[PDB]
């Protein structure tokens, strides 16, 4: 896999050179590069951004810089991930969904966001997916970025209830019975009904 | 705010010593700490993880090491969070919660988490909570408190639908003429339009 994340902030992904994604780089399974947007830049001050139509807070991320970015970097077998909290819920089938890409390239937004033209424009050369993490809102793409690539890897490497280990007996709280009883079936039994009334108590939208 | 943050990978934090974050810190606003979960450890292997009880596949991180931990950074004002793909939702609304906080502590599991115990003995001094940034499973919890992180540190320091910017025509792709109109009351009108059918189509769960 070919994976390319376009950004004003590059030490910010810096987390994909360590652990396992890290692994899955100097192992060969992904090449990873991290841009800086500036670098498609031309004006005095090396701007990526400008005020918005219509007014707002804050500045938009200019079309013109983001269509030059992707014109070098982007191919038509590229999927192309606009992260964006407007965009659809990245989950574990996405990431299994991923791992069959050649080419994944992340426009990561800073400031109110990319103007929507460059999700447009570039539709009409690849597949494009404007995707949110979580029903919350963050300063930049980065740190999404990171988790979705992450979730990606930890597949692609694996590919090519409650947990507890010693002591038995800790604090006063003990190792439930059923753990260390060596009974594979009840032990199945157990964690997936601990399983269903945690997911009934947090997650009934599950 | 103070914020510990407590892994067997510390470099993977380093993002939230850049950007909005980074500014957060230097300004005095919030006291980040990232700890190595291995300073805990006594044995000659400085090892934070053992076999699980009833088997299944990896590792555990071992409670004596994460009590040990925890009781030297913890205190009863506390909130600790442990990342796990089990817990309740990460919301905008928990992000805005967190910054009526005075100490967060996020506990990054690795392997196959943190044994169960450790969260059980901490409820019994101070505040837990095991929260899940989404749908999705990452190698482990360090993305997640980067994310959470960002999104508190973002509301903090600014207490303490589509994206359009120049120029008007670009690659055949127009700005919306109602942007370009100047009128508030239009303006707001098609945002929130636009908003509520892109809700529909992508996150009909909102
Ligand atoms: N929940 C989330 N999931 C994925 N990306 C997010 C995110 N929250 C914020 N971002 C990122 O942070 C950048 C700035 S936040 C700007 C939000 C923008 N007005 C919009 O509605 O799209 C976004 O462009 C995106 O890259
Ligand atoms: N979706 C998510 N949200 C928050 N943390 C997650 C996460 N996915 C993985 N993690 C982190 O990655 C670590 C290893 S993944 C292990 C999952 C574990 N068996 C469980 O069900 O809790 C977890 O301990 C947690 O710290």
Same mark, same amino acid.
């Given at each position: ?37 500036? !670098? &498609? /830049?031309?004006?005095? @001050? ?6 918005? =139509?219509? *007014?707002?807070?804050?500045? %938009? ?35 299994? !969904? &991923? /791992?069959?890409?050649? @080419? ?6 800073? =400031?109110? *966001?990319?103007?929507?033209? %460059? ?88």
């Amino acid at each position: 896999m070919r994976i390319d994340i376009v950004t004003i902030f590059p030490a910010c992904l810096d987390p994909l050179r360590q652990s396992l994604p890290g692994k899955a780089i100097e192992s060969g399974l992904v090449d990873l590069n991290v841009h800086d947007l500036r !670098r &498609w /830049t031309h004006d005095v @001050h090396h701007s990526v951004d400008d005020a918005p =139509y219509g *007014g707002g807070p804050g500045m %938009v991320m200019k079309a013109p810089v983001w269509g030059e970015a992707l014109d070098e970097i982007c191919s038509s077998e590229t999927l192309l991930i606009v992260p964006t909290p407007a965009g659809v819920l990245f989950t574990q089938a996405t990431a299994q !969904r &991923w /791992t069959t890409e050649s @080419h994944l390239v992340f426009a990561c937004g800073r =400031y109110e *966001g990319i103007d929507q033209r %460059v999700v447009q424009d570039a539709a009409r050369r690849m597949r494009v997916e404007e995707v949110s993490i979580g029903d919350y809102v963050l300063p930049g793409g980065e740190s999404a970025a990171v988790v979705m690539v992450e979730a990606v890897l930890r597949l692609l490497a694996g590919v090519l209830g409650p947990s507890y280990t010693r002591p038995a007996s800790w604090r006063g709280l003990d190792v439930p019975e059923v753990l260390l009883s060596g009974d594979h079936a009840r032990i199945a039994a157990w964690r997936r009904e601990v399983s269903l009334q945690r997911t009934r108590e947090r997650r009934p939208d599950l």
